[PDB]
Design an enzyme around this catalytic site. Structure first.
Site, mmCIF file in Angstrom:
data_model
loop_
_atom_site.group_PDB
_atom_site.id
_atom_site.type_symbol
_atom_site.label_atom_id
_atom_site.label_comp_id
_atom_site.label_asym_id
_atom_site.label_seq_id
_atom_site.Cartn_x
_atom_site.Cartn_y
_atom_site.Cartn_z
ATOM 1 N N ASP A 38 28.350 58.482 -28.827
ATOM 2 C CA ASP A 38 29.807 58.411 -28.549
ATOM 3 C C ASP A 38 30.374 59.298 -27.452
ATOM 4 O OD1 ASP A 38 29.486 56.639 -30.487
ATOM 5 O OD2 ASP A 38 30.630 57.771 -32.031
ATOM 6 N N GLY A 52 32.364 54.923 -37.889
ATOM 7 C CA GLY A 52 32.873 55.901 -36.946
ATOM 8 C C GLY A 52 34.370 56.123 -37.037
ATOM 9 N N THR A 53 34.866 57.033 -36.205
ATOM 10 C CA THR A 53 36.303 57.211 -36.049
ATOM 11 C C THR A 53 36.845 55.856 -35.602
ATOM 12 O OG1 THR A 53 37.209 57.767 -33.825
ATOM 13 C CG2 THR A 53 35.328 59.072 -34.589
ATOM 14 N N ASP A 104 20.232 60.724 -37.772
ATOM 15 C CA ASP A 104 21.131 61.733 -37.189
ATOM 16 C C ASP A 104 20.804 63.133 -37.717
ATOM 17 O OD1 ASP A 104 22.883 62.549 -39.489
ATOM 18 O OD2 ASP A 104 23.588 60.494 -39.397
ATOM 19 N N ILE A 156 25.578 50.687 -40.934
ATOM 20 C CA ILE A 156 24.834 51.937 -40.939
ATOM 21 C C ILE A 156 25.740 53.119 -40.735
ATOM 22 C CG2 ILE A 156 22.674 50.849 -40.219
ATOM 23 C CD1 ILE A 156 23.145 51.559 -37.465
ATOM 24 N N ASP A 182 34.131 65.539 -29.155
ATOM 25 C CA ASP A 182 34.014 65.464 -30.592
ATOM 26 C C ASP A 182 32.563 65.638 -31.061
ATOM 27 O OD1 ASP A 182 34.964 65.283 -33.214
ATOM 28 O OD2 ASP A 182 34.633 63.094 -33.257
ATOM 29 N N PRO A 202 27.212 67.078 -36.017
ATOM 30 C CA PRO A 202 25.841 66.678 -36.371
ATOM 31 C C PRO A 202 25.609 65.155 -36.540
ATOM 32 C CG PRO A 202 26.428 68.679 -37.575
ATOM 33 C CD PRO A 202 27.626 68.318 -36.716
ATOM 34 N N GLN A 203 26.629 64.434 -36.987
ATOM 35 C CA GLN A 203 26.510 63.006 -37.234
ATOM 36 C C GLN A 203 26.393 62.213 -35.950
ATOM 37 O OE1 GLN A 203 28.737 65.505 -38.843
ATOM 38 N NE2 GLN A 203 30.336 63.960 -38.618
HETATM 39 N N1 LIG Z 1 26.348 54.676 -31.326
HETATM 40 C C1 LIG Z 1 25.331 54.622 -31.840
HETATM 41 C C2 LIG Z 1 24.063 54.552 -32.477
HETATM 42 C C3 LIG Z 1 22.867 54.266 -31.877
HETATM 43 N N2 LIG Z 1 21.863 54.272 -32.748
HETATM 44 N N3 LIG Z 1 22.444 54.566 -33.938
HETATM 45 C C4 LIG Z 1 21.845 54.705 -35.124
HETATM 46 C C5 LIG Z 1 22.606 55.016 -36.225
HETATM 47 C C6 LIG Z 1 23.967 55.184 -36.076
HETATM 48 N N4 LIG Z 1 24.579 55.063 -34.893
HETATM 49 C C7 LIG Z 1 23.804 54.751 -33.835
#
Ligand SMILES: N#Cc1cnn2cccnc12
Length: 290
Positions: free
Chosen positions: A137, A13-14, A78, A10, A119, A122-123
């Protein structure tokens, strides 16, 4: 990991791949992060106790096989996709105000425990159907530093980075999070990134162009920062009514304080929670597409 059934990738990440997964004994669906130093394990385990309604809960930390996995609560969207999705019409202001208010609550909590995000973007702001917004994070940068590319060689965004970080300050504070959240606030309002830099000088110079090249008047000690150069172009400051229309007087007042150059002048989370912009805050529910 044997107790988890990967539903889908899904994210990326970094730090590495993020899966939606379902706990094989607890039925639980979670976000499963794949990311070993002694320090990093002791930093993550601090993060287990740092719980708040506006912070995505770290459910578990699995250290097996010299691999590290973090299990978080799963949220379905997000703020980046929500913003794309609301491009044509914009996020209604009362919803923008609610999100900013909840996010400042998150930071006020974290910061009170001397924990920075570093960091924000929006994401990493995760939204549910209930009108809630949470920070993801948190505390991960200090545990694992902030990379230029992601494990997928994706370019880390500079857009929300504070000037003092860009100017090479090593020892920066919680004010860095305030900067980023002010950039996001502007973005929600206007439907454009504030400062969409594609290198560090381009990010620094996009800042200077809107806010004015800082000097010793507005930011004492700026000219002695590690990567400051006397040869910086000297740009005039723009008025905010041009920057964030059609945000109102309170919002624009709040925004300018979250974007002070001098990190010590910049509004705290706790003081921003007291701003009159939030006088009439409510909790709307967004309309989402799961
Ligand atoms: N980290 C994290 C996280 C918790 N729920 N999420 C949904 C989509 C993407 N990342 C996460």
């Amino acid at each position: 990991m044997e107790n988890f059934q990967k539903v889908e990738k899904i994210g990326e990440g970094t730090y590495g791949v993020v899966y939606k997964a379902r706990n094989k004994l607890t039925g639980e669906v979670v976000a499963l992060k794949k990311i070993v130093p002694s320090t990093a394990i002791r930093e993550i385990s601090l993060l287990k106790e740092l719980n708040h309604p506006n912070i995505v809960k770290l459910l578990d930390v699995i250290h097996t096989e010299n691999k590290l996995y973090l299990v978080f609560e799963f949220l379905h969207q997000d703020l980046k996709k929500f913003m794309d999705a609301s491009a044509l019409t914009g996020i209604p202001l009362p919803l923008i105000k609610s999100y900013l208010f909840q996010l400042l609550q998150g930071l006020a909590f974290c910061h009170s425990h001397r924990v920075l995000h570093r960091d924000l973007k929006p994401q990493n702001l995760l939204i549910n159907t209930e009108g809630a917004i949470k920070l993801a994070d948190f505390g991960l940068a200090r545990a694992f530093g902030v990379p230029v590319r992601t494990y997928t060689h994706e370019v880390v965004t500079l857009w929300y980075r504070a000037p003092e970080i860009l100017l090479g300050c090593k020892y920066y504070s919680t004010a860095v999070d305030i900067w980023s959240l002010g950039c996001i606030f502007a973005e929600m309002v206007t439907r454009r990134a504030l400062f969409p830099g594609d290198s560090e000088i381009d990010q620094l110079f996009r800042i200077f162009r809107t806010l004015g090249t800082p000097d010793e008047v507005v930011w004492p000690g700026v000219t002695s920062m590690p990567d400051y150069k006397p040869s910086f172009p000297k740009w005039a400051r723009q008025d905010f009514s041009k920057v964030v229309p059609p945000l109102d007087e309170d919002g624009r007042s709040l925004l300018s304080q979250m974007l002070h150059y001098d990190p010590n002048k910049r509004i705290s989370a706790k003081a921003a929670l007291a701003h009159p912009f939030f006088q009439d805050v409510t909790k709307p529910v967004p309309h989402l597409r799961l």
